[model samples]
Target: KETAAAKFERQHMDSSTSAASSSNYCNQMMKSRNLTKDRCKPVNTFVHESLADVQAVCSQKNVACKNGQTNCYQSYSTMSITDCRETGSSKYPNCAYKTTQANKHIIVACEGNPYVPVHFDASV
Candidate 1:
């Protein structure tokens, strides 16, 4: 079984592609990574940096949650991340995506032992 933290990393972290030089990234990844189960996820993000970098955000300055929750943290350093948005021409079980890369600060929610990032709140 996959833990929530690991699942978040699995579905959201990818360093192999940065412009990726690959157009089929989103289409291939969304399914291959187990995100296309009962239905396709509309919008998802993949961090293209090391776990150490991602985890470092937990120790950065505090920020309001994008969803208005009170436990989010904002990263001080900009990181590599991929934004995957499904195309409108797609139907259920058939998902397509536009993969884009950017250098931006990430917002996340951290909790528990060792204080590592657990949820991706947003990015800027």
Candidate 2:
């Protein structure tokens, strides 16, 4: 069984390497990461920071999740991140994305006994 923490890493973590500057970054990444299997993910972000750093966000400041959960937290430090947005012409199994890179504070949902990131909520 895949833990939420592992799934979180798969969906959002990008630490050291990136094709971010490339126009096809999102297109390639979305497929390689198996996110384009059924349908395109309308929007997603890759965080270019150490796993420890991202996990540490859980200890930053508590906040309410968009769904009204109380387990969300916002990072105190602005992290380097790249956003991938699906294009208007995107079709299922043939997803396309437009990349946007920036530094921003991340918000995440944490859970489990060790208290780790389970979701990439948003960036501020």
Candidate 3:
């Protein structure tokens, strides 16, 4: 069974700055990260923090997720992040995205033993 931990790493982790400056960053990443399969993911985010730092978030105080999951935790400090949303003109198999980079505290849902982030919930 595929675990949320591995899926999170594929979809959201960006510990390096590679291609982060390109206008096609999301175009390439959506596919590279496997976010675009039979359909394009409408929106996604990438965090440019060390894996350790991101994992440490699970130890923070629990908070309610946007959809009411109480296992969510917010980053104690702001992190470098990029949000990618599909362009209105975007279409499946040719997904295009608009990238917005910001520094914010990220919220994520952590689960399972050796608890770690599984879902990207929000940013604040």
Candidate 4:
């Protein structure tokens, strides 16, 4: 089985900023990256930065996670990223997505046991 950490990297990490094209990027990437398994993933993020930099976010400042936990941290520097959101006309198999790239501070949730990123909470 693929580990949670590995799955996070596979789904979110895209070292190339070119991963996000003009439109329909999410539609292609979501399926290509295997986010369309049991169902299509409505929202997801792709980081166009090095894996080391993404991992370094764990050492950044502590922040509030969506679940109200303080295990989340935000990146100190701005990073190139593509945000994929589900469009209203989106269907199950034919999932539509609104993909846009931006430079922003990424916030992520980390785990203590293995000490790695477990969830990508949001970007600011």
lDDT of each: 0.80, 0.90, 0.90, 0.87
lDDT of 4: 0.87
User: Candidate 3, residues 43-116: lDDT per residue as tens digits?
Assistant: 99999899999999999867999998799999999998888999999999899999888898999999988799
Worst 10 residues of 1 by lDDT: 15-24
Candidate 4 residue lDDT tens string, 85-105: 989988888878899988999
lDDT of 1 by residue, 6-97 (tens): 77787777756544457777788888788877888888888888888788888898887877866788889888887888888878778888
The positional error of residue 25 in candidate 3, measured at the CA in angstroms, is 0.7
User: Which prediction has more favorable lDDT, 1 or 3?
Assistant: 3
Candidate 2 segments exceeding 4 Å error: none
Location of the lowest summed lDDT over 10 successive residues in candidate 4: 16-25
The reply for model 3, stretches above 4 Å from the true place, is none
lDDT of each residue in 35-91, candidate 2, tens digit only = 898889899999989999999999998999999999999999999999999999999
Models sorted by lDDT, best on top: 2, 3, 4, 1
Ranking by TM-score: 2, 3, 4, 1
Question: Which consecutive 10 residues in model 2 have the weakest lDDT in total?
Answer: 14-23
Q: Which candidate do you rate higher for lDDT, 3 or 4?
A: 3
In model 1, what is the error at residue 117, expressed in angstroms?
1.6
Alpha-carbon deviation at 120 in model 4, angstroms: 0.5
- Which TM-score value belongs to model 3? 0.94
